[PDB]
Design a protein around this ligand. Structure first.
Ligand SMILES: CCCC[C@H](CC(O)(O)[C@H](CCCC)NC(=O)[C@@H](NC(=O)[C@@H](NC(C)=O)[C@@H](C)O)[C@@H](C)CC)C(=O)N[C@@H](CCC(N)=O)C(=O)N[C@@H](CCCNC(=N)N)C(N)=O
Lengths: 99, 99
C-alpha cells in the first residue's frame, strides 16, 4: 500500500500472537514495542531520541507481520508510549520513501 | 526520488541560507533542527520523544528546500542529536511511504 503522511502512519502489526497498532518510522533504526510479557532470551539496550534514553529488552529473530507482510528481526521491548516499526523491519517489507 | 531504508535517509537541506544534513523522519509530526538563528518571531514550545521532552523555539513560515524541493512551514530549533524533517514538511514535498 501507499501511506501518506497527512496523519501519523499507524498500521496494524502482529507480534507474539498479538495484534497491535504501530507507527512506521523511517527515523528509527530499530523496532520498539510496548511492554509485552514475551518469552525468549534478551540483552539490555538503551535507545535514545530527543530528550533522553529508555532502557529496553532486545530480543532477536522475532516474527513480525506488518499490514500482512512478514518480517523477522530484532525487536526492542520497553516502556515506549507508541509502538514503532523501524528501518530494520521496514526494509524487509520493501518500504521506500518517495517524492 | 525513491529512497530505500538500508541506511538512514539523510538528505541535504537549505534553511536560512545554510546547507545542512537532516533525516527524513515519518515518525516526527514536526521538523526539529539543531541550534541556529532564524528570522521572524519565535515562541517557546516543549516537544517530546520516546525518551523525554525538550524545550524548543518555534519559527513559522520558514522556507526550507529539501533535496531541491521547496517547502515553507514550521521549524522547531533546539537540542536534537539529529536534524529531522517531519511530516509537516514531508507532506509539502509530496512524500509518501510505499510498500
Ligand atoms: C511518540 C513516539 C514517536 C517517536 C519519534 C522518533 C523519531 O522522531 O523517529 C526519532 C528521530 C531521530 C532522533 C532525533 N528516532 C528515534 O528516536 C529513534 N532513535 C534511533 O533510531 C537511535 N538509534 C538507537 C539505536 O537508539 C538513533 C538516534 O541513533 C528511537 C525511536 C529508537 C529506535 C519521535 O520522537 N517523534 C517526535 C518528534 C518531535 C516532534 N515534535 O515532531 C514527535 O512526533 N513528537 C510529538 C508527539 C508524538 C505524538 N503526536 C501526535 N500527533 N500523535 C511532539 N509534539 O512532541
Amino acid at each position: 500500500p501507499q501511506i501518506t503522511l497527512w496523519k501519523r502512519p499507524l498500521v496494524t502489526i502482529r507480534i507474539g500472537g498479538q495484534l497491535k497498532e504501530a507507527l512506521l518510522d523511517t527515523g528509527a533504526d530499530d523496532t520498539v514495542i510496548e511492554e509485552l510479557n514475551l518469552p525468549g532470551c534478551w540483552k539490555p539496550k538503551l535507545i535514545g531520541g530527543x530528550g533522553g534514553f529508555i532502557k529496553v529488552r532486545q530480543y532477536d529473530q522475532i516474527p513480525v507481520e506488518i499490514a500482512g507482510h512478514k518480517a523477522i528481526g530484532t525487536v526492542l521491548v520497553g516502556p515506549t508510549p507508541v509502538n514503532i516499526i523501524g528501518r530494520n523491519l521496514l526494509t524487509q517489507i520493501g518500504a521506500t520513501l518517495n517524492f
